[PDB]
């Protein structure tokens, strides 16, 4: 199934008393640990909303963007998924003022494209130092926009791993009326986020399961081969 109750083994967990109070309506009272739990039913409906809206945007042929910069776990997952399917991404920290203006981004990415295609044209004609620094600049441009080269226009849809951790990204997103979906952990502002998926990020198992489900949701809509469609079974991936 999808978002099965019995399929999941570790969905609770959070540092207590660091949460925004109005996020308590989507959480049931704690039993012993006071580590913020989550009502799995509303999680299921939120994931269903995400699933149907990603199908809808797939019919619209909209551009998808993945945003995540946590230490290693979701970073590795997003890198693997991004090299698996066509989607914009970023591994370095979110550049201040990226979404708010794309004209400078457009000319910079055009510069990146012309330089990389000139490297492709070049056959090591340039001397060791010239192409050495040119390749260093190419690698720097890969560090900067090596994940957002797959689009020329505004991002038609974007996921946020954590708006608190990505305050700049969600702040830029609030400026524009483009649809934005995020993962409210326990301490976010619902008015900034458009579609809400109150899942957990304090544990890596929850993050991997949810990202796998959403990646399958956004992949199977495009009729590309997928990994999980309606299978209750899942792959266990414990953090190193």
């Amino acid at each position: 199934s999808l978002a099965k109750l019995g399929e999941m083994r570790t969905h609770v967990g959070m540092v207590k008393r660091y949460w925004n109070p109005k996020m308590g309506f989507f959480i049931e009272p704690e039993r012993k640990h006071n580590n913020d739990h989550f009502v799995l039913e509303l999680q299921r409906q939120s994931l269903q909303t995400a699933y149907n809206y990603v199908k809808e945007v797939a019919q619209n042929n909209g551009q998808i963007l993945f945003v995540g910069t946590k230490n290693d776990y979701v970073k590795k997952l997003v890198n693997n998924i991004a090299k698996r399917v066509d989607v914009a991404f970023i591994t370095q920290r979110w550049l201040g003022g990226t979404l708010t203006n794309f004209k400078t981004l457009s000319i910079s990415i055009n510069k990146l494209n012309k330089l990389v295609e000139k490297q492709a044209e070049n056959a090591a004609d340039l001397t060791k130092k010239e192409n050495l620094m040119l390749s260093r600049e190419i690698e720097r441009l890969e560090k900067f926009f090596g994940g957002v080269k797959s689009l020329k226009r505004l991002p038609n849809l974007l996921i946020v791993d954590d708006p608190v951790y990505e305050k700049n990204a969600v702040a830029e997103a609030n400026i524009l009326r483009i649809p934005v979906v995020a993962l409210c952990n326990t301490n976010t502002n619902p008015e900034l986020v458009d579609f809400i998926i109150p899942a957990n990020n304090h544990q890596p198992q929850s993050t991997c399961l949810l990202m796998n489900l959403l990646a399958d949701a956004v992949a199977e809509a495009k009729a590309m081969p997928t990994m999980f469609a309606y299978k209750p079974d899942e792959e266990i991936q414990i953090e190193i």
Binding site: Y53, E56, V57, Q59, N60, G62, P179, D194, F195
Partner: peptide, 5 residues
Amino acid sequence: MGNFD
């Protein structure tokens, strides 16, 4: 929201 189809 949800008016994008």
